[model samples]
Target chain A: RDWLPLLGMPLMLLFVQIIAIVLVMPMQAAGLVAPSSVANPLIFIGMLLAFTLVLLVLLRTGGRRFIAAFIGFALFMTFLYIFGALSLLALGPTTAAAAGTLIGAVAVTALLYLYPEWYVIDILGVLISAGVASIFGISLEPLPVLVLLVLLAVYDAISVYRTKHMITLAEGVGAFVMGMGDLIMPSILVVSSHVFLSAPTLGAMVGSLVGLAVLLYFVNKGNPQAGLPPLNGGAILGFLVGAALA
Target chain B: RDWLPLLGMPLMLLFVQIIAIVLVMPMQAAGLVAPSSVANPLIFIGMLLAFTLVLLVLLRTGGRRFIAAFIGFALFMTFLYIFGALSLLALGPTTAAAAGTLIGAVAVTALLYLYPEWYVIDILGVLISAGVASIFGISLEPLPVLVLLVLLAVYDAISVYRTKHMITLAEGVGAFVMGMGDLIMPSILVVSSHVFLSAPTLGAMVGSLVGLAVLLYFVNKGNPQAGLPPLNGGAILGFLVGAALA
Candidate 1:
């Protein structure tokens, strides 16, 4: 059906989220961050501040052009960080890897600039989202992840509800951010959970399902209900379920 | 925008999963699973056998009405188990939780039977998928999760490649099972990675991305490839990346 076409971008984004969840363990195995512990409260605080700062900057810098640039910089930095981290840590060996990443980055930049075909935009957005998820998943852990989700869910609720600020922000950023930013922000919590948390399982899937339930209800109701509630809520639920079964 | 309808399903699914993940750690904090180490491995093996047995039992049964009844039972029972584990175990209030869970299960089952709209199928499927993911995520750890991913992926591959069996199964089960089953099955590994492992991060997310990629490529090619490779491969990559950072 025609609806299949619309499924492309969102599905791609969700798919990357699922990938990020799986990567959490191996990233830990590689020794990117400390084993999850109660001692890591500072990191959680720091990340919360960081996300707040980013969102603030996004809000402060108001313009289609700025949003466009912000999206570009965000994607660029994320992928750059991923590649740099991979190389610096010697996750693999390859001179071509660096160059390939650059070329890929440039190609995406070009696409953003040219406003390439919608399919290309959708497809590349998938790759970018996947890459971003992996990078963040490697960087953060459960507590920080949990903190991030909780904070964002609160922020999302506030922005969507109390302030009505996100409406302006969403409209300002939505179109311009598509190519460069890739609707990737809301889903970041998903990867964040997978990275700092436990193994993937039926729980995470089911949890995501739970989230979608509320999301669909609100979406049809014609109101934004903060994406992170379902997202972080699912991650947190999945995490606990995993721990219990474990 | 018509695809907004389809988005309704995944969005709904995501909401439920979010709740499920959030419920994960709280359950563990309350001591539902005993010890993570033992419970993780036990659940992995247990679920594998459980799903297999369910599949086999359904296969062996000769009644169309019975087959439908059996699937319905499995779905509801599993949902109850999830709700039971999350609420009953975490809060130590089994009666209330059981009642709520039963209502959830029955509502979904009723939707599946009497007046099943297409959207209803997708919506219920998302809720159930979250239920399944939460249960499994809590049950196992990274290595066991990885092992299980491998096992299931291999089975999925066989079901598709060597036998062309599951396609037939899909056809017979029709849209209902396929929608719900596919929505949940690929995600099992995702939940496993999050719940069971330590320093949870990048590997699992990357793995799932790869898994999604694998699924997309094969589904598009209209050919068969083992389902697990992409997921397992992503997990492996993310794990190595994590290790390198460590």
Candidate 2:
């Protein structure tokens, strides 16, 4: 039985996405991103803009499948370099880290021909998510994470309704498998900014809750709306409430 | 400028696989299952083997891309059902989970036809990984996880290098956007087996580490090694060690 592929699938997707919200929320509450600073959330916005600019330019240049593949491979290698720097040598972690960044950049360029899978993309996503969140969460406080979410909500709204950078990101995400790997890079910072190593706070939990709420709602409508509103908005509100109580 | 890609990307991938050890180590320490508990791990193995059988049959079926996509999509939705039942909802939180999975499935199928750009695949990859990891981690204990890995690593080796399953998966991974999504179901379980809700023991970490070490070596040589060994090996070792220590 083909089992009515088109009919039941989207509803299922929506259900899981909502669950993703729950899983993420508890993490946020625990200071997954350290939800205290506005600066943190903005990191995502900046990256989205960067992606949009580059993607748009590429598209405008009439570089479709092959060029896009080329770009993705380049990024893959660059990230690879970053990994190398971190793992290849113990003489200087910092040096290795720097080298890794460049190496990763270089590697991505080379792999243009490979046409890797989306699983790699996701692996990179989780890797960055854990990395960025851990580092930022450890360094930043809840306040910055909160502010970041609020700003992101606004930014998400703007991007969806006005700017459309995220839409660009979302729309073109699957085009280049490698590009998707790079795209997940920025959102990790958002998660990091929300909660890193703290007890569950109202702010962090709320921010994720609301932010996801709006994002999911918009997502369900089958029309693209900003993803950040519910996520960032909930995050921001959660932060304020938590801080007031704390 | 496009940088040259390295032969070591696969090697690095192999090495990066060690991180999955973190998932299973704690389970061993907790003794979720008994030293005699091989049946549980067999469950995971059974499911995985079932998946592999399907994959092999499909590859030899000489079908078009849509056939693969269709099977892949169906598999994915079923996988989602397993995921929701085991991880989030099974624990008792089922209210908001309804219809969510269906929505996710629909969105994915629709997107495949749209011929989206590259990065979108990566984004979807991340979502699937989180989902898969969450579910498998929730369901299995160290013993079962260990069994799953042991069987998978051998299967992966046979299929890719010997029987050519891995080659088929790699080739098909990119051609069908949904294929990569399907594969994540197994590997994420490897990671989930290690670190879903708790910090695993060093043994589990070491197991994953060695498994990764082996996979990384092969992966760098230009063949896409199945990701099971390091993932499963580390999980089993970690679980046993944790049990011993406790």
Candidate 3:
């Protein structure tokens, strides 16, 4: 069963990326694209920094109960956004669709908040990952997305190695942290390339999987390593190769 | 001289309340009243809860340096708001006014980040506290402001007595942690009452001071106690008495 997941990791990556690519179309169709700008990625990084500070203060003030409840609430809100967007696309802004989406999201989020068993957490994480990737995928063009990935890769390296704060953050949350940006960054490349569906995009996807394999090897070695540099670098290289070939 | 400040806590209370009252009119004149609503106070509480959680997480993850830098940036932004609002009220929204405000705020914030001397921190805290109280006072009507103060008082009790995490948070930050909400909540009552300029508003302001005196008495007793309940209760009672007489 354990080995099964190891085998499943590559498939999971493919699945998340594919779902994100598919969702990108509908999200765009629904006028849900984030305001595109060269500064969008940096703005996101700033927000993450702000969010981290806020979380830390709260945890210090309120302790574990507050953190747990707040994260649950945040997850619920995110699911609501995802479902609302999807429903708006499916049912074309009808009241029924909105109500149905709201209810469904509430049910799912409540379950996750209440139970949050391993399987439940994993599934929810995947859905959230796909949703986030799709939103960013639709929002960012290739060049900015490329810049974002590269910058994040370097930041990830610093976070893991120099500061080691990301590791602490993951442990503090007491959940499967999933090396999230590692999953999202490569998929972002695929999603950006989906507009063309050309060789470069496909190569990037495959390259990301190769990077994941390497990351997994490092994970087994029992020392923390930054996940993004390898994953993002491989995807970017594959994209460049495919672009050149094409 | 040290005893002077001890004797002057009442004056500080009056001073902050007066400034907030003074600023409310101009802030309103400049259309700076935070889009008022019946739910505005509740929304503020929710934001506070959210803010607390985020800060705790960041502190846990990133440690002191990150939180300190982020807070310095936050202080800079708050100063920008305070100065920008002041400038806008004084001289209309001109390029120079905006630019000057931004630069001034940045310079002050940079100083706070670099030195953070006791006087600098105290002065900056007063400015920020007044800014917040003025904004919220204008935004919320008297009733909601009263509700918010009462709710916060209760929450303060729980935080100091039940959880006591606030103490730890202060110690962990290794700085004089202002009873931030304590400073803001009663002042909220003063701000809300300012429009009337009647005995009630004046009474509430004095009442908050009286409460502060009581709190200080307890503080001197060498055991931590919730700061808000007495402060808020006295303010509320004073306001009610003044209202009844009126």
Candidate 4:
């Protein structure tokens, strides 16, 4: 029953795209710029490598609770951003909004700790990925995002084939564990197109889904790295073609 | 630990008040009228008697699943209203807003039935109570709502002492089982004051809590009826005092 839910992946991916697209409005209005710039990509990759190392080592050292705590903290802050921005946009920037945001973050994180059901986890993943994608989408233009996508695609391959690190990280983390990068990287371009370009947005989205279809068709085992290579390529191709047509 | 949830009652009551206050903005904007007048209070009482009778009879008949399904549907539609109204205010009544509202309702209801934890139910209860409070707050004037609260308080007493039906339903239902009326009835005043009067808002809120303190002090057993008599009186008294001062 826990097998790959055929609709689940596509549904979550679609949810990621839709939510990030919707989120761009509030995040932009709320002014959540990523100081993480074109260099932001490099910083992300660098930090990701470091972050991965820490978690992997933490897992090896049996610091699972530390990883859990750090993950919990990260999820809380991320949820805070998502709920706070929406609250700000809807309720205005007041203590009420702040309080509302706090209640949501506390409730959501508590739910996760109390009952990490697969659907609950998947829903949280959608919010986290979309939020991160929207922020970066606002931060970078198509080119920088394009650069990040390619760089990560390359790194993804290296991690899987050579270093064998992501394998450990994949096992180390959990389900929906197959690289948030796969979902987020392509989505960055989708949001960037919608926010920055405002054209090729649908093209990028359609292409990203097509890329996902291809990746799934080709997916033999459950390595996280097997994702971004095809996923990023399809989004890029879709965006360029869409650019030309538009 | 679910004994009384000392803080839980006030916390939920506070959450209900705050959310309804904020909710007034969207609900007014969205144009939700009770359609139900000073006659509204009478209409509500009539309906409540009917609903209570039906539910108690259903319990007597051993129609638990029927009750569950009806309650589930009610929760779904009520959640739809809350999320949709907020989405309308924030997302500007687009398909995206509709879609977002649908997603939240579906996800929330799914979570509840899938894992009806105490906190989850409490959170859902807050949203339901607040959403209803906001809508009625928008619908009626102070005098009419005053009319509603008094009548319900009287009905509550009869149901307890004379009819003795509330105990049966109280047993028939679950914890957090104490009449939702205790929370919603007074809150109608808080939201109405905030929306219609705007001056007595704080006075009423403070008074309601004080009233709840009185009710709690007087609370002897677990009967749902023990609540409204003191609770409603405090809210009305609070509103009158706040009105006089303002």
**DockQ winner among the candidates?**
3
DockQ of predicted candidate 4: 0.01
Candidate 4 lDDT tens digits, A137-207: 88867777888899888877776676566445677556455556467778888887666635656788777
RMSD of candidate 4 to the truth, in angstroms, is 21.3
**Which tens-of-lDDT digit does each residue in B45-110 have in candidate 2?**
667679777666555543334344435445445444434343334334443453353344445644
Highest-TM-score candidate: 3
TM-score of chain A of each: 0.64, 0.47, 0.83, 0.83
The CA lDDT at A238 in model 2 is 61
How far out, in Å, is residue A6 in model 2?
Answer: 30
The reply for model 4, stretches above 4 Å from the true place, is A1-5, A35-38, A54-66, A163-175, A220-225, B1-246
lDDT (Cα, tens digit) per residue for candidate 4, span B93-183: 6999999999999999999889777687778788788888788888778767876676556545433453354344677656554545468
For candidate 1, lDDT tens digit of each residue in B120-233? 766666766666665666665555555445544543443344245435567765665545555554454455555643444445555555555666567658655555556556
DockQ of each candidate, alpha-carbon based: 0.01, 0.01, 0.10, 0.01
Model 4 chain A lowest lDDT segment of ten: A61-70
Off by over 4 Å in 2: A1-246, B1-37, B40-69, B72-101, B156-197, B201-214, B221-231, B234-246
Looking at model 4, residue A236 earns an lDDT score of: 82
iRMS of every model, one decimal? 23.4, 16.8, 7.3, 25.4
* Candidate 3 CAPRI-style tier: incorrect
Tens-digit lDDT track for model 3 on B109-195?
656644457676667677788888888777757877777888888977987786567566777654344555467668887877765
Assess candidate 1 and give its TM-score to the true structure.
0.39
TM-score, candidate 2, is 0.33
